[PDB]
Design a protein around this ligand. Sequence first.
Ligand SMILES: *[C@@H]1O[C@H](CO)[C@@H](O[C@@H]2O[C@H](CO)[C@@H](O)[C@H](O)[C@H]2NC(C)=O)[C@H](O)[C@H]1NC(C)=O
Ligand SMILES: *[C@@H]1O[C@H](CO)[C@@H](O[C@@H]2O[C@H](CO)[C@@H](O)[C@H](O)[C@H]2NC(C)=O)[C@H](O)[C@H]1NC(C)=O
Ligand SMILES: *[C@@H]1O[C@H](CO)[C@@H](O)[C@H](O)[C@H]1NC(C)=O
Ligand SMILES: *[C@@H]1O[C@H](CO)[C@@H](O)[C@H](O)[C@H]1NC(C)=O
Ligand SMILES: *[C@@H]1O[C@H](CO)[C@@H](O)[C@H](O)[C@H]1NC(C)=O
Ligand SMILES: *[C@@H]1O[C@H](CO)[C@@H](O)[C@H](O)[C@H]1NC(C)=O
Ligand SMILES: *[C@@H]1O[C@H](CO)[C@@H](O)[C@H](O)[C@H]1NC(C)=O
Ligand SMILES: *[C@@H]1O[C@H](CO)[C@@H](O)[C@H](O)[C@H]1NC(C)=O
Ligand SMILES: *[C@@H]1O[C@H](CO)[C@@H](O)[C@H](O)[C@H]1NC(C)=O
Ligand SMILES: *[C@@H]1O[C@H](CO)[C@@H](O)[C@H](O)[C@H]1NC(C)=O
Ligand SMILES: *[C@@H]1O[C@H](CO)[C@@H](O)[C@H](O)[C@H]1NC(C)=O
Ligand SMILES: *[C@@H]1O[C@H](CO)[C@@H](O)[C@H](O)[C@H]1NC(C)=O
Ligand code: CUO
Ligand code: CUO
Ligand SMILES: [Cl-]
Ligand SMILES: [Cl-]
Ligand SMILES: [Cl-]
Ligand SMILES: [Cl-]
Ligand SMILES: [Cl-]
Ligand SMILES: [Mg+2]
Ligand code: NA
Lengths: 655, 655
Amino acid sequence: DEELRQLFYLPYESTSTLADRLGIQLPPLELSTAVTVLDPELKAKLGSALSIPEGIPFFAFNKQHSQAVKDLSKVFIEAKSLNVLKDVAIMVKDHVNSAVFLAALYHTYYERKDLSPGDTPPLPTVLPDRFVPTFIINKAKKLAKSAIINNQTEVVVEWHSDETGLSSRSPEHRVSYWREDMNLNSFHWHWHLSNPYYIEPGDRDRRGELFYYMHHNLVARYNMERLSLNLKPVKAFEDWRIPVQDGYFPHLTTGNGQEWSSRQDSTFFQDIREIPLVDSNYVSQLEMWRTHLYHGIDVGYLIHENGSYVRLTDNPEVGEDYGINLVGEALEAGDSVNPDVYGNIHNLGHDFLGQSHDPAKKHSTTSGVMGAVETAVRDPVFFRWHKFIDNVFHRYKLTQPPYTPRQLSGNITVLNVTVQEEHWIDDYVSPENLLHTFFTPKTFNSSSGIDFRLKRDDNITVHIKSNFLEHPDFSYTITVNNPTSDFKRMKLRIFLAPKFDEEGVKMNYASLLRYWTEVDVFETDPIAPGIAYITRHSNESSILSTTAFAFSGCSWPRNLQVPRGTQDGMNFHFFVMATDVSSSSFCGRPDQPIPDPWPMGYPLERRSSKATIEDFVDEHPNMMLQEVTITHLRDPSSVLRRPISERKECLLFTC
Amino acid sequence: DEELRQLFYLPYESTSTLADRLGIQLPPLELSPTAVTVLDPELKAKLGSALSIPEGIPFFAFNKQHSQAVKDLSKVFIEAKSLNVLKDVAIMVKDHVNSAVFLAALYHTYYERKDLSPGDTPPLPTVLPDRFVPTFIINKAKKLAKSAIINNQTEVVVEWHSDETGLSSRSPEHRVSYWREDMNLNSFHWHWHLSNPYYIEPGDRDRRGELFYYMHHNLVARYNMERLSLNLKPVKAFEDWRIPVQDGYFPHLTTGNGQEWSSRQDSTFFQDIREIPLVDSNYVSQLEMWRTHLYHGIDVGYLIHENGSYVRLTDNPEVGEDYGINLVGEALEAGDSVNPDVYGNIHNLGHDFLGQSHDPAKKHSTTSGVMGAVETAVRDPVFFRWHKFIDNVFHRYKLTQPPYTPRQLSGNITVLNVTVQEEHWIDDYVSPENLLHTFFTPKTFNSSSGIDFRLKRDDNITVHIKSNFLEHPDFSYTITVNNPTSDFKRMKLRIFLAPKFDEEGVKMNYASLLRYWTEVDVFETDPIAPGIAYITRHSNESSILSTTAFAFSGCSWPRNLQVPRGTQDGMNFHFFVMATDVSSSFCGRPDQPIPDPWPMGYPLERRSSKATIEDFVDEHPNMMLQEVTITHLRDPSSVLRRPISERKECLLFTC
Ligand SMILES: *[C@@H]1O[C@H](CO)[C@@H](O[C@@H]2O[C@H](CO)[C@@H](O)[C@H](O)[C@H]2NC(C)=O)[C@H](O)[C@H]1NC(C)=O
Ligand SMILES: *[C@@H]1O[C@H](CO)[C@@H](O[C@@H]2O[C@H](CO)[C@@H](O)[C@H](O)[C@H]2NC(C)=O)[C@H](O)[C@H]1NC(C)=O
Ligand SMILES: *[C@@H]1O[C@H](CO)[C@@H](O)[C@H](O)[C@H]1NC(C)=O
Ligand SMILES: *[C@@H]1O[C@H](CO)[C@@H](O)[C@H](O)[C@H]1NC(C)=O
Ligand SMILES: *[C@@H]1O[C@H](CO)[C@@H](O)[C@H](O)[C@H]1NC(C)=O
Ligand SMILES: *[C@@H]1O[C@H](CO)[C@@H](O)[C@H](O)[C@H]1NC(C)=O
Ligand SMILES: *[C@@H]1O[C@H](CO)[C@@H](O)[C@H](O)[C@H]1NC(C)=O
Ligand SMILES: *[C@@H]1O[C@H](CO)[C@@H](O)[C@H](O)[C@H]1NC(C)=O
Ligand SMILES: *[C@@H]1O[C@H](CO)[C@@H](O)[C@H](O)[C@H]1NC(C)=O
Ligand SMILES: *[C@@H]1O[C@H](CO)[C@@H](O)[C@H](O)[C@H]1NC(C)=O
Ligand SMILES: *[C@@H]1O[C@H](CO)[C@@H](O)[C@H](O)[C@H]1NC(C)=O
Ligand SMILES: *[C@@H]1O[C@H](CO)[C@@H](O)[C@H](O)[C@H]1NC(C)=O
Ligand code: CUO
Ligand code: CUO
Ligand SMILES: [Cl-]
Ligand SMILES: [Cl-]
Ligand SMILES: [Cl-]
Ligand SMILES: [Cl-]
Ligand SMILES: [Cl-]
Ligand SMILES: [Mg+2]
Ligand code: NA
């Protein structure tokens, strides 16, 4: 139902206001203004859903907030039909926190089999306040008021990065376009609502490992963006007695008029003394959880709360859990084997950072953006926290034995690899193995999210325009040989990493492990004996799902599919492996197991005796190491032939 | 001109919006690159730097560029040939000037023009309610307004409590937030600085540097009395600028342009302000060297003029010589300093260092904190730490002065008796002699003169804002004196208040009390006939007051804060009375000299060989030391007779 989709709209307005605008029939009303009557029978089913007060965000990492979303979605998910779901939504909407309501709805599309996440509205069209700076939203309300007066039905407002921080004095602001990318922040929301740590254990396959894998890829790609910008790779925030050097001022205000808290430079990670105090958590508490978890990783087993020991291995027996998954569930934490011993490090860390401006709650303040999944990626400290988290996972990966020859062997030989950018501008054909990136404006209709009307009959639409990194489509072709006498199935596994570090030194195999990111991992049609060519288009990538919002549901943003690269051209490894055998691979499918038994990111998450990626690949005929150049264009038209006039004369052959 | 007063209204709206609402005839209009007044080139050429301050930021009173802009705009207003022309100029420039700069210039104009009276200016909270009322409350008002209009309701009242801006149970400084955030006190601060701006043409005020000292000394002293009433320790100067400011402050204020005031976390360093542009920066060690230079001048008894000559510092001046306290004040503020290059601009810049300490290198595109503006700075607990430092500099200077000689303290009139009596305020209770009370009472004002709450033009909506204030009953005092001479004698009575005991319960000696004395009433009497006379003064006549939520207009110590809070059990205060031989006193009069040649606060700002105030007063028949008790009532009706039936028995005589 596009009737269902309407429930996402105008989340800060009453159900009556939404219903009036949309011609939705309402259940009985009463005065709390006009508010729906909440049937006692429905209320009895709602668990803790109503316990979260209106006027604050959904704090996804907080136990009480997550339980409320889980409790509300439970009713939505268990509704006997979509018509009944629609009725329950309409009835409860006036009585639940709006962000909790929205989170529960999105989660419901992932959990219900008769709903598709691709049919949910793009998050920025629903909660534009989460992605657009305070001053721009305020400027839009102004422009709307004037437009209505002068009988203008449309207005467009826009902004630029030059307006939320000063790059010339703040190196971290150089990558704010990427951290603040509305599609990336929405992807983060989708990931956590598709794979919430509070999910009933068993209803996901390898969710702890997927937590590791998606965030590993998120951190790796961030670093590629940093290298593209002449920044040093992100440093883990691991010594928690050192103040967080780089603060962050989000410049965001919620639809309830609540401006998000900021964090000054040089703020300490401090004990959170909650209200009530008995709900508090402490830095040395998190440190001891970390100590316990490091011990378990180092000795190769966790202790179950039931007293038994659980082996950690990424070479499991049939029916045994993967060690990476067990560590992930313990670290997030989700379905931990022992909450009392290993704790809740990653989630609470978000809340410590998000409350660090007022950790003893003396000043009656809001949380910072680290406290919410749809905003946390904006903050540079997100990536310092996740580099720490990825370090824990890599610590575990290093305890695993290298893949054996048999574990890496394959029947298919990889013979060649070529990458070709598609046509994107007249009179230019990209040389082979060269990819480009550039900035392009995108515009969306914010009136689905914010009611800009002064009075009922006003006809006003506010469009919001801003710049996004983007790239032309590209394809690649893998040439393989099947030397056997029968048809062979294979999975192609393709990963990207920069060739050089920030010092210009070639990264060895060990260092590259921290960088490999998924380009495309998929099964081919059966390969006939002999030579075959397999061609994939960038829009088909395993990391994508299926107008400012190209891909819907849970998807790595298509516009951030290619790292920025540099004006001179930046060199990347393009690793290809042929191995014997519609949702984003980063997101998984709620109702299906991970098909592939190999660990996520295989084979490039384990140590090797080989010193270089070159030496590693040379050992295996089913692996090939290709190379591409990625070039950022400040002015895309620069690729065009310039006249003989205006042509530049070079001092040293090239200029 | 009540048409003049209208210019203060709806400061965030266009001139067209104001004129339309008020039926003001407009000059020619045009469309800016909406309807805006045409600004005559002839007027523009007269405006100096007034137009250089962009719309959308506050007036930053301590900043030299902002103050110059207010001075430049007010100049045109003040020099206008008539009030009709003044109104014309105001109407014409309103669309083209920063609104806070506009308002400041207008208030200053009432002080500076002889045909205008500051008492006729609107109360500041009715003009800029956003400066005094929390963000959440203004936003709640907008919501209540929208609903009211829809339901044909022409009036709405919103209110709030201190429990909503900080948590007293975890933040001792919040216990005195009611006083620091008192809207009348903050308005008084605005008035003081616009009546006595440091940028005034030198000579157009008498002893302005000394008045800067004196008003702030009284402001700090009264704050300390409020702290003692609340079982808080007296305020500590912020003097070692290497130490982070322990107590932060989150103002919870948002301007009418939607710009939320910056906050300051606990434990924030006082840091170099690297301005944009960088050449406009100032540095902590720079301020420290100005301080070193000033301490030196104070200690050796002279300042060095920028012309190379030395200027003696003395509070015993020759006729025609400046007062040392005045010279120090002008150097410290700074205002008409003898040597800007040597003594600097310590006090003003310190406000800006503190106000920008959340982002001192301007990396994060942020706004200033409340310390940057005169109408908000008093809210911040650090205001009083900064002013305790400032008062310490002034006291350092006062201590270099020789004690008053017998001749300087002698008088013809003898003080025989002193009595204080609270007026009637509740039926069936008469206050015992020498007992004063305080309690909290609500006050309400109409905010619709400041904020346009209309959705569309024809809406009839008024938003009242209600909140609690400290208050006290009227009181009077009577001084019994004797004139033992043979002719009529005129005298000035000088009455000061200070607590008797410090925070440790120890009797404060003479030296300690110097830091506490605050003006109660200083005034000249009618000539006193030979023999005995009784002089009775009502509290509403006090010299510290000027002449409905806003009792006294123009520049006045708040009547509601005239009496320190006191305690539930009753707190004891010295009430010092001196008879000396011959429009708030804190504000002075713009056009007239200080009539009294004695230093402000005489004789209780100099050292004495006498150890106690008792010993000091006993030496002089024209001085008497009285004592009063001040008792705060949580519930004012508690003073009433209770039913014999309901009285509870005490274990230890009293309970
Ligand atoms: C911008 O977005 C909103 C989507 O909510 C559109 O508003 C709808 O417009 C249709 C056609 O006028 C109305 O029938 C609906 O009642 C509107 N929905 C709501 C909730 O207001 C709007 O049309 C879009 N504007 C443009 C230019 O496409
Ligand atoms: C609240 O304050 C405003 C003063 O600004 C009053 O609004 C005026 O009301 C009169 C009478 O209706 C109008 O003619 C004026 O045009 C209004 N002025 C403005 C600027 O709107 C309002 O009346 C006050 N409300 C009460 C109850 O006193
Ligand atoms: C409002 O404006 C839109 C776009 O400007 C126009 O297409 C439409 O006819 C109007 N809608 C209504 C209901 O008046
Ligand atoms: C603890 O739980 C695990 C579940 O896998 C089980 O295998 C083990 O037997 C349990 N320990 C005991 C002694 O119950
Ligand atoms: C190749 O295919 C055979 C037959 O399916 C399979 O059993 C074996 O695992 C593969 N061998 C190699 C060389 O990896
Ligand atoms: C791979 O393909 C590229 C271009 O299509 C070509 O330069 C190269 O010769 C090929 N290598 C092999 C082994 O076919
Ligand atoms: C790839 O996706 C983008 C956005 O959806 C689209 O512009 C482009 O045409 C797509 N390419 C193809 C051939 O589908
Ligand atoms: C607005 O409402 C008030 C009462 O709240 C009323 O006195 C006044 O007449 C109204 N204004 C108009 C123009 O009707
Ligand atoms: C410097 O200024 C003072 C101010 O009174 C004046 O008396 C003195 O003559 C000046 N010094 C010189 C040398 O000009
Ligand atoms: C007392 O009055 C006389 C006459 O005016 C005056 O000279 C003297 O200064 C006054 N004060 C004292 C203490 O003598
Ligand atoms: C002062 O006045 C009070 C009350 O009016 C009286 O009781 C006391 O005796 C007086 N003292 C003198 C010295 O007159
Ligand atoms: C003193 O001022 C207050 C506030 O304006 C007023 O309520 C009281 O009546 C005044 N007292 C007298 C007697 O003027
Ligand atoms: O989890 Cu995805 O934000 Cu730390
Ligand atoms: O000066 Cu009155 O605010 Cu420091
Ligand atoms: Cl149901
Ligand atoms: Cl942008
Ligand atoms: Cl701590
Ligand atoms: Cl508590
Ligand atoms: Cl600069
Ligand atoms: Mg100090
Ligand atoms: Na909110």
